């Protein structure tokens, strides 16, 4: 124990990234979106968000148990003081990673370049998003490499709200010839934000007045 706070919080941020990488490799076929981490008075809670929880929370505690024991050994956790949890997802249509990997698998499952694109696009779009852009680079029709952009809806690119509302995911897909790139972008709806601002930082809304029939000639009411 006994580590500089400056070094610890970093050292932690390292851990997160090392976990998040791992779980992306192992649990890719389960649609893993991401993880949270929680230091508590005893017990550390690794929370796994995946759209196929049963292949994670496995054969009655199994599988996730491998995944716990795989951890206690790595980072030298005394058993029990760390406990892996399982989530489903907050609608996979809104998560770039779950989508990114979907383009990967779909392409891996032999699908058509343009079809894989639009089919992802249309899932996000019909998941209540504000827009979606999927960009595949690589060797599409072989030889001289090109890049294709399939977008629908609305995006921004510019300042801060790019970090608020849109999250992206770049995934490497290994193919028959070389490799292709899968950059999925998903701009969500500020109207449903919940935590953060509920509009673009330049959306001006004006509440409409009221027709009036003035005069009325003075008068007064007593109680």
């Amino acid at each position: 124990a006994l580590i500089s706070k400056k070094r610890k919080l970093v050292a932690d941020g390292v851990f997160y990234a090392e976990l998040n990488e791992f779980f992306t490799r192992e649990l890719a076929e389960e649609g893993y979106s991401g993880v949270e981490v929680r230091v508590t008075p005893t017990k550390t809670e690794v929370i796994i968000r995946a759209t196929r929880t049963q292949d994670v929370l496995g054969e009655n505690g199994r599988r996730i148990n491998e995944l716990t024991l795989l951890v206690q050994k790595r980072f030298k956790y005394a058993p029990g003081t760390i406990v892996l949890y399982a989530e489903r997802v907050q609608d996979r249509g809104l998560s770039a990673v779950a989508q990114a990997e979907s383009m990967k698998f779909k392409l891996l499952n032999g699908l058509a370049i343009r079809r894989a694109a639009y089919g992802v696009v249309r899932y996000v779009m019909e998941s209540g998003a504000k827009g979606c852009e999927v960009v595949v680079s690589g060797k599409l029709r072989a030889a001289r490499a090109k890049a294709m952009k399939f977008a629908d809806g609305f995006l921004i690119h510019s300042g801060q709200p790019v970090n608020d509302f849109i999250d992206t995911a770049t995934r490497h897909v290994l193919m028959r010839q070389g490799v292709l790139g899968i950059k999925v972008k998903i701009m969500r709806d500020p109207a449903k934000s919940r935590t953060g601002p509920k509009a673009l930082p330049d959306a001006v809304t004006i509440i409409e007045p009221k027709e009036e029939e003035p005069i009325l000639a003075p008068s007064v009411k007593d109680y």
């Binding site: 990488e21 791992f22 490799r25 192992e26 491998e66 024991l69 795989l70 050994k73 790595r74």
Partner: protein, 96 residues
């Protein structure tokens, strides 16, 4: 990989007593973390294994993650004892 059997035992006892292996990509380490044999051993002991089924391999941030499959634990029940672990049960909590 050469290696004696009394070193090849502890590896397979540990690969089932815990059911999973720490690994780490570092040859010339001499002695694992648990397993009192070469870290080179443990790795190339489980390179033969996963190369013939039994256990699955995963590599990230200079660390293999050796996970034992289904057909594996049956290569153990012949190589070790009995027929009636680790990854199958045990539920902690200090209960206090």
């Amino acid at each position: 990989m050469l290696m004696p059997k009394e070193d090849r035992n502890k590896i397979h006892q540990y690969l089932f007593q815990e059911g999973v292996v720490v690994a780490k990509k570092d040859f010339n380490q001499a002695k694992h973390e648990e397993i009192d044999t070469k870290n080179l051993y443990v790795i190339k002991a489980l390179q033969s294994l996963t190369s013939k089924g039994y256990v699955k391999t995963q590599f990230s941030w200079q660390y293999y993650y050796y996970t034992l499959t289904e057909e594996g634990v049956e290569y153990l029940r012949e190589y070790l004892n009995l027929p009636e672990x680790x990854x199958x049960x045990x539920x902690x909590x200090x209960x206090x």
